[model samples]
Target chain A: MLIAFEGIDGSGKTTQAKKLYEYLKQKGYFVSLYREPGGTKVGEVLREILLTEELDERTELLLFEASRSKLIEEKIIPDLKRDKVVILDRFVLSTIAYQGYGKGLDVEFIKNLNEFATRGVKPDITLLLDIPVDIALRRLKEKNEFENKEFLEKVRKGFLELAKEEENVVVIDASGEEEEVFKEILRALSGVLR
Target chain B: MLIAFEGIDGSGKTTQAKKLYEYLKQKGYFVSLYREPGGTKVGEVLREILLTEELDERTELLLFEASRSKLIEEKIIPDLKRDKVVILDRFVLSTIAYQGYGKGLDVEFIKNLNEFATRGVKPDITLLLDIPVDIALRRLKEKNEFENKEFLEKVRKGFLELAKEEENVVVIDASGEEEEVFKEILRALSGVLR
Candidate 1:
């Protein structure tokens, strides 16, 4: 089984993904965790450029696709071939949110480009941690290091809209407390897990 | 105008490219020289991993594509848009030689992948430098590098075979002196310039 966790920036997707990875691993399921724009050796290098916050859309998308290519070719396929339960922190959905809807690029074109990049490798299940824009901005402020509310709001709406349309997306209301949000994710995962 | 110089590993393509760059600059041509897998800032980072010589075929091709993506995005396209004469020391042809023919990877697949990576950017003129495998191997031995005669032979034949099928490819004998080779390049460029 391949599972992915996706959300806007500052939505605690990484934390939740890690929590799920730990839970599934402790339960004796052969599992591995990977983050998008990175997962393998080359992917790590690409992640630096993608998340630097200074790149233009074209550069960012190119880096993201390149990273995705590296991930699929190097890590994701091998793990899946070995029958490991692979959990990704993000995947093509991020391209839909960040590059397509958020940045107002041609969504269809971006989606197709992503499809080309991944060579049709997608998660069997994707958990979309949804949160309202303003509320998510407020939570991000308390986190201290990330201080870009305007961009975060855009990304928030981006993910929310993406979840509404995508087939594999599972909307979890992460506006609630951490434990509550995890419960929602657990509830979603139950539907996909054996 | 976009010109590409290509050949086997020790075939003196780099020296010839530099000489052509100098010659073009002297002739008051708006010229810029670049190397594949490292022409742009992001490409430079990818290039390091690509030339490491220990990676698998998939890793090699993905890294090559990544670097090519960066090279075109950040440099080649913009330069061409501004009407500058761009010369790349190596490009997709090298990929076709090393990965497609030499390594016996799927030729059609590599071509398609390269087209996607380059976003349909094709060289206006491609100058292929040909050297006998024995001569190239002899040079490698004198330079104190690993001399894979069999591999070099394969790559040499690979380039020759690729050139035969590819449009815009002009072959030149690289066994001659650098000055002699550059003169032939100038003769080839004269046609495009005219």
Candidate 2:
């Protein structure tokens, strides 16, 4: 089973992904955790570039997808073949949200490009941590890695839209406090992961 | 005019590209030379990645296109806007030959992805430096960067095939000595560049 946790930057998807990874490890599901633009040597290099550089939207998307391409080919595919439960902090939906919606690139184009990068493998289940943009921004401001409210709101909007449009995404009510949200994730996980 | 030099590695495309850039510069054409997976800051970064690491073909293609994406938006488009004669050491055709053909990836898929990277921009003229794979391999081996003869022959076949199919690609007989090949390039340049 391949599961993905996705939301805007402050939605706590990464935190939840790691949490789930540890929980599943304890559960003995033969699990491994990986992050988007990570999990491979080339992905790590591209990850640094993504953080450090300001790039055009298309270039940014391409770099993100390149990192994803490396991960899917080298790490994810092999792990899945071995029947391990693979968890991703971000996956295809993030591109659609961030690049397609926030950056105003074509959604359909992003989807097709994602198909190429993923080679038709999507998360068997996606966890979308839906939250109010205002609340999300406040959480983000506590950290140094920040985007203004406006752009992030657009990404937030995109995430919701994708949750509605795609069957794999399971929307989690993320407005509550941390433990509450984790419980919500647990409920969602039980249904699909059962 | 945007011109591209394309062939397998060690096919003299880079040499001829620079030669054309110099000649055009001497002739008072506003000219700028760039190489594929290079030109912009991100492109130069990706270029090193391409050289240093072994990557899967799709991942390799994505990185190359990411660099090309950056170059098109930042360098090539702006230069073309200013009416600069852009000279590329390799371009879309190289991807077709190397990744699509040599690596046995899908040709149509590469074409569509190239369209995304290039944003519908193609060279006004492409110089395909046609040479035998055996000769090309000898040149490649001299430089201590080597690919087996079989792979290069497949790439050589792809280049020849592309030259036949694409209108912009002007096939240049590159089996001759350096000065003769340069003269052939000059002749081809005079017609399109006039």
Candidate 3:
């Protein structure tokens, strides 16, 4: 099964994704954990370009999609075909939230672009760690230009709206303690995990 | 005026683009010459990723588009706004020919992606240097992996079809002598150049 954890930066999605990977590994399942834009060699190179440079919104969006396409082809598909549980730190939801809502790109265009990039590979379950923009900002150590509160608030709203629209997505209040957030994620996974 | 020279690998587009840049400058025109996948700083980084690494077709397509988008935003648009003649070594036609036809991706999808990337910026004049695959491949010094005859044939045909569909594109026979090809290119530009 392919499961994805998504939220704004510093919202504890990575922590939860790693926790779930460990949890599933301890439960005797073959699990592969990865972070987007850096899982594959090409993806790692693309990630450096994305972080170290300033790009227009469309260029930034396409670069993210390029990394995603490479990750899906080079890592995610083969792992899933081998019957391992694949946990991703971020996926399509992050693109829609950050680019579509925060950067003011058309949501429908981003949705279609995501479908094209992933080649229709939807996550079996998407765990969205919901948190307030202020809390998310306070948790980060080094912030980039994209970490502004006003933009993140729009991204937060985009994630919630996505959760409301998609059946496979479950939103968790991640403003609480990490342990509490992990428990909520585990509860959300109970219905899908074997 | 924005003029683009496009063809498969080793098709003399680069040499001709430079010649035109010099020719236009000698004629006292404000001219800017650039290459695709390397015009801007971001584009140069993207070009390295595209050349040095292997990527799936979708990823490759998106990366090219990303570079093009950055070029348009950071260089081409501003140059044109300042009344400089922008000459490109390759442009949207290369994507349609190489990725869409040669790589067997959907042509319509590539066309739309090009539009999205360029934000509707079409070249005022496109000079397509047409040649047989074998002749084109024999002309290169250091051939990249994309120099295969079969792939170049498809790309050659794709460029021709694009010339037929677009009004701004002018097909030039590039198999002739270098000076002859330059004359043909100059003739093609006569209708648009000041």
Candidate 4:
């Protein structure tokens, strides 16, 4: 099964995703955890470009998609075919939220680009760790332009709206303690596991 | 005026593009010369990734588009608006030839993605330096998989087909000496200049 964790930056999705990976492994299921923008060797280089380079909105969107495409082709798809549980820290939903909503690019264009990048391979289950914009900002010690509260508010709404529309997405209140957030994620996974 | 130089690897597009840039500059025209996958700073990093990394076909296509998108938004569009002559070493045509035809991707999809990447910006004139596949391969000292004759033959056909379809494309015989090729390039430019 392909599982994805997505939310605004500093929403505890990464920690929760890792926790779930450990939990699933402890339960004796073969599992692999991958992060978008930097999973494979090529992804690492793309991630550097995405993070450090000053890119226009369209260029940034394409670079993220490029990195995700590599990750999906190189690591995610192969592991899925091998029957291992694949967990991604971020997926196409993040692009929709961050680029489509935050940057104000056309949502339809972003969705189509996401489809092209993933070749229509979406997550079986996506955990949307929803958090308040203020809390999300406070959680990050170092913030870039992308981490501003106003921009992240739109991204947060984008994630919630996507969760509402997509049946495979599970929304979790991530504005809590780490253990509590992990419990919420596990609870969401249980519904999908059976 | 936007002029694009296109051909397979080692087909003298770069050499001819620079020679034209020098010719145009000496003639006192405001001109800028940009290379594919490496014009802007972001493009330089992306070019490195494209050249050195082991990327899947889709990932490779997206990276090239990403770099091109940045060049268009950051440099090309602004320069064009200022009425300067823009010369690109390669553009969407290269993507169509290398990625669509040679790599056997969806040609239609690549064209659409190219449209999106450039925001509908196209060359006023595209100079296609047509060369024999064997001679093109022999011209390169260090070659990658993309430099092989079989792959380049398909790319050559792709470029030729594109030139036939697009009115602004001018096909030049690049199997001759450098001086001869430059003369042909100038001959093509004269039609557009006057």
Which candidate wins on DockQ?
3
Model 1 CAPRI quality? incorrect
Chain B alone vs. reference chain B, TM-score for every model: 0.94, 0.96, 0.96, 0.95
Q: Give the per-residue lDDT of model 4 (tens digit) for A80-166.
A: 898999998988899989988889988888898888888898888898989998888777865553367788888988888888887
Give per-residue CA lDDT, model 2, range B1-194, as digits (tens): 78888887777888888887888789898989998878988899899999889888888998999999999999899999999999999899999999988999889988988998889998888889999988887898899877788888888899999988988788898888888999988888787766
What are the runs in model 1 whose C-alpha is more than 4 Å off? A52-59, A69-78, A81-83, A103-121, A145-167, B77-83, B103-121, B147-158, B176-180
TM-score of each candidate structure, all chains considered together: 0.81, 0.95, 0.95, 0.92
Ten contiguous residues with the weakest lDDT in model 2 chain B: B185-194
The residue pairs found clashing in candidate 4 are none
* Clashing residue pairs, backbone N/CA/C < 3 A, model 3: none
lDDT tens digits by residue: candidate 3, B133-185: 88887787456434578788889999999999988899999999799999999
Candidate 1 lDDT by residue in tens digits, B64-162: 776787778777889999988898998888998888777877778778768867788999899999999888877788888766777768888888988
Please give the RMSD to the true structure for each candidate, in Å. Answer: 3.6, 1.6, 2.1, 2.5
How far residue A67's Cα lies from its native spot in candidate 2, in Å, is: 0.9
Runs with alpha carbons beyond 4 Å of true place in candidate 3: A141-146, B141-146
Please write out the lDDT profile of model 2 over residues A167-186, one tens digit for every residue.
Answer: 97899988888899988889
Question: What ranges in model 2 sit over 4 Å off?
Answer: none
lDDT: the better of candidates 1 and 4: 4
Model 4, which residues run further than 4 Å from truth? A141-146, B141-146
> Taking the true A–B contacts (Cα pairs closer than 8 Å), what share appears in each candidate?
0.08, 0.79, 0.95, 0.87
User: Which of the two, 2 or 4, has more TM-score?
Assistant: 2
Shift in Å, residue B77, candidate 3: 0.5
lDDT of 1 at A14: 89
